[PDB]
Amino acid sequence: HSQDLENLYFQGSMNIFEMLRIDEGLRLKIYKDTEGYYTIGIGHLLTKSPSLNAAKSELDKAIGRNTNGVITKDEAEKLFNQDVDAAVRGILRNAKLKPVYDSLDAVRRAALINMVFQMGETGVAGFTNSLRMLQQKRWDEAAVNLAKSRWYNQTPNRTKRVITTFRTGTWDAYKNLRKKLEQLYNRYKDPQDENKIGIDGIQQFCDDLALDPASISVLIIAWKFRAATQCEFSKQEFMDGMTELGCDSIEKLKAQIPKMEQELKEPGRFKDFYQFTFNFAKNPGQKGLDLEMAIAYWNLVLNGRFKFLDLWNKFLLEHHSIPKDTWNLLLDFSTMIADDMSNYDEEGAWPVLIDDFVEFARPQIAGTKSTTV
Numbered sequence: 336h337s338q339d340l341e342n343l344y345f346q347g348s349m350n351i352f353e354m355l356r357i358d359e360g361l362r363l364k365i366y367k368d369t370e371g372y373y374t375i376g377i378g379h380l381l382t383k384s385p386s387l388n389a390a391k392s393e394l395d396k397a398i399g400r401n402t403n404g405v406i407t408k409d410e411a412e413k414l415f416n417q418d419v420d421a422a423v424r425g426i427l428r429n430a431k432l433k434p435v436y437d438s439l440d441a442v443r444r445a446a447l448i449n450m451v452f453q454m455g456e457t458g459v460a461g462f463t464n465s466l467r468m469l470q471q472k473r474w475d476e477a478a479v480n481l482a483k484s485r486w487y488n489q490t491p492n493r494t495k496r497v498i499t500t501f502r503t504g505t506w507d508a509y510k511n512l513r514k515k516l517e518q519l520y521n522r523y524k525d526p527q528d529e530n531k532i533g534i535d536g537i538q539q540f541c542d543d544l545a546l547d548p549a550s551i552s553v554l555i556i557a558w559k560f561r562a563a564t565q566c567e568f569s570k571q572e573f574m575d576g577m578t579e580l581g582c583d584s585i586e587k588l589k590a591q592i593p594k595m596e597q598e599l600k601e602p603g604r605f606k607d608f609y610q611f612t613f614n615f616a617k618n619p620g621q622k623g624l625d626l627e628m629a630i631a632y633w634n635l636v637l638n639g640r641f642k643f644l645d646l647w648n649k650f651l652l653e654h655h656s657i658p659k660d661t662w663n664l665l666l667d668f669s670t671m672i673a674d675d676m677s678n679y680d681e682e683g684a685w686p687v688l689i690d691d692f693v694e695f696a697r698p699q700i701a702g703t704k705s706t707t708v
């Protein structure tokens with residue numbers, strides 16, 4: 336088949352796909368991009384349709400099988416290589432980019448393609464002076480000029496690697512990035528399972544970040560890393576997370592923590608974090624979340640947000656598993672409920688647990704109403 340990766344075995348192992356895997360990241364399951372559009376692989380837009388089934392239909396046509404929205408790394412490379420061929424055709428039609436592209440060696444061509452993926456042809460074509468320097472093989476001067484640009488300020492770590500590629504004509508910046516992340520992962524990995532960081536490694540990670548391991552900030556990091564389960568941090572989770580956060584060091588990750596915290600000020604992002612917590616805390620082998628574990632995580636994530644959290648604790652402690660829908664709807668209850676619960680709609684199809692809670696809260700509510708200020 337024309338797309339077979341065996342047709343590229345004459346190339347080096349480092350290539351444009353592996354470059355963008357480092358600079359942008361790779362997703363093997365359909366996800367929504369910044370604009371809400373279904374995407375997979377390295378930034379491959381599937382459709383603007385709101386229908387996941389439509390996105391799956393487009394993916395199946397492009398891959399050649401029924402994927403149910405999940406592909407392999409090799410399949411993602413085939414999709415990406417088609418996108419590269421299209422980007423190169425565009426470069427070759429562009430009077431502002433063709434001369435420099437033609438003049439460049441293969442490694443530096445990859446750096447230019449990287450730029451086009453990030454900012455489009457129009458954006459790259461704006462770099463008139465730097466492109467002329469590249470065409471003249473004035474590598475150090477091009478590197479200096481590119482570093483003065485807004486591009487550098489927008490994505491400093493990616494831009495530094497692309498600039499180093501123009502400066503040297505080698506893959507050194509990508510070899511160095513990979514080694515840094517490998518050596519950092521090796522500081523944390525479980526000595527008995529190289530595929531994960533265990534509890535001791537998570538503790539070392541927290542210590543290196545100057546985080547109380549009991550801070551909600553730890554769970555915020557797990558959310559940003561899309562961690563599947565508490566007490567484990569898989570190698571893929573660590574590498575994908577450091578990539579998506581643009582960090583190759585603990586110092587850089589430490590600087591990102593306040594930005595992750597700030598994201599939660601949006602109710603939509605807090606809801607995402609709140610819903611993530613359920614699947615993260617649940618035992619993989621169980622369908623629901625044990626009540627005691629639910630209470631612990633509820634107290635971490637809802638303290639200061641749910642005005643009836645203390646009453647909720649008392650209600651549950653006098654109770655005898657929590658499904659996902661009950662977990663999710665507690666946040667909606669917290670958002671709508673009046674300070675005295677007077678606006679609760681019993682016909683609203685809330686979980687029985689919440690119906691019972693509203694009834695249980697009646698003595699406390701009444702007592703407060705008869706208490707002097």
Ligand SMILES: CCN1C(=O)[C@@H](NC(=O)c2cccc(C)c2)[C@@H](c2ccc(F)cc2)c2c(C)nn([C@@H]3CC=CCC3)c21
Nearest residue numbers: 537538541548553554556557562565566567568631632635
């Ligand atoms: C504070 C809530 N938390 C967690 O967020 C856990 N994090 C994870 O595993 C983890 C997984 C992947 C990636 C990252 C960054 C974290 C885990 C834990 C915390 C600190 C620690 F160094 C080791 C483990 C844990 C434990 C054992 N308990 N919980 C408590 C649960 C409920 C309330 C308070 C804390 C925590």
